[PDB]
Design a protein around this ligand. Structure first.
Ligand SMILES: [Ca+2]
Ligand code: NA
Length: 297
């Protein structure tokens, strides 16, 4: 995972191991090495500086200059800083008796497949999901979700071309009633770039449907551009959480590493493979360990 960084961070720590106690200037050099590794993983300057400051403080508070094994102290403190940067404690959207969640994002984020994989996850946890294919302009996008729903065994409502939000809301509520659906997953329109008309429609769909989560699906491999997509969707529509797809293809992790700081939104799920069960709850502590080479490989 995040191969270059992980290698980079492990290299920085390992360059310390077996060489006894270090000085404050030595601690300085390692810290600069970490900061550069993060920046090369596309982390912005402020986020990287904050990370390194966190590590400095916490390492001092653990006697890194007294330790005959300071590499281990740096390992532990880089692991805590990674854990917090990645979100801290693991987070999932809250479940009430009934839920209505939007999935938003660009064409290419894997949003539509993600909607189906989410429905499957929640069905397995005992939910009764309904997928809603809400693109009112592109029948093919709706048909794609129809056939994904058939694969994962989850029902799909398809909107009509040009259907009003009020008509959508009514057809959704009725189907949800009749089928005892308790988790409605609305796959909104995906485009290659955002423009004013869809955003307007979506912000409008949000007013009418009143979702209680708005999950933004981002291709993790887009690094900083994912964060720019996130602020556009958050200011124009309003987001509640993130899903990062193709986390297996991302050698760097910079969007992931920066999301809490920059967006203030949690990463709920990771797409880590093309398997149906490739969409997994996101586990910052687990991922921090992995980046540092601990645990399973
Ligand atoms: Ca309005
Ligand atoms: Na997709």
């Amino acid at each position: 995972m995040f191969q270059q960084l992980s290698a980079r961070l492990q290299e920085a720590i390992g360059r310390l191991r077996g060489r006894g106690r270090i000085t404050e200037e030595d601690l300085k050099a390692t810290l600069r090495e970490i900061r550069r590794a993060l920046m090369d993983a596309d982390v912005n300057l402020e986020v990287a500086r904050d990370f390194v400051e966190r590590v400095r403080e916490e390492a001092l508070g653990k006697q890194v200059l007294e330790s005959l094994t300071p590499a281990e102290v740096i390992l532990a403190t880089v692991y805590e800083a990674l854990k917090e940067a990645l979100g801290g404690e693991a987070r999932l959207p809250v479940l009430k008796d009934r839920n209505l969640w939007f999935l938003v994002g660009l064409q290419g984020s894997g949003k539509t497949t993600t909607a189906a994989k989410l429905a499957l996850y929640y069905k397995g946890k005992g939910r009764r999901p309904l997928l809603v294919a809400a693109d009112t302009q592109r029948p093919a996008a709706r048909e794609q979700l129809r056939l994904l729903g058939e694969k994962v065994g989850v029902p799909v409502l398809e909107v009509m071309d040009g259907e009003s939000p009020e008509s959508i809301r009514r057809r959704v509520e009725e189907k949800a009633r009749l089928e005892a659906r308790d988790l409605i997953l609305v796959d909104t329109a995906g485009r290659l770039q955002i423009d004013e008309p869809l955003m307007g429609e979506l912000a409008r769909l949000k007013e009418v449907l009143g979702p209680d989560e708005v999950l933004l699906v981002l291709d993790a491999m887009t690094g900083q551009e994912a964060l720019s997509v996130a602020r556009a969707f958050d200011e124009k529509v309003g987001v509640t959480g993130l899903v990062l797809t193709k986390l297996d293809g991302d050698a760097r992790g910079g969007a992931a590493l920066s999301a809490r700081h920059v967006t203030g939104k949690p990463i709920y799920f990771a797409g880590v493979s093309e398997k149906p069960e490739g969409l997994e709850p996101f586990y910052p502590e687990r991922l921090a360990g992995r980046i540092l080479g601990m645990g399973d490989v």
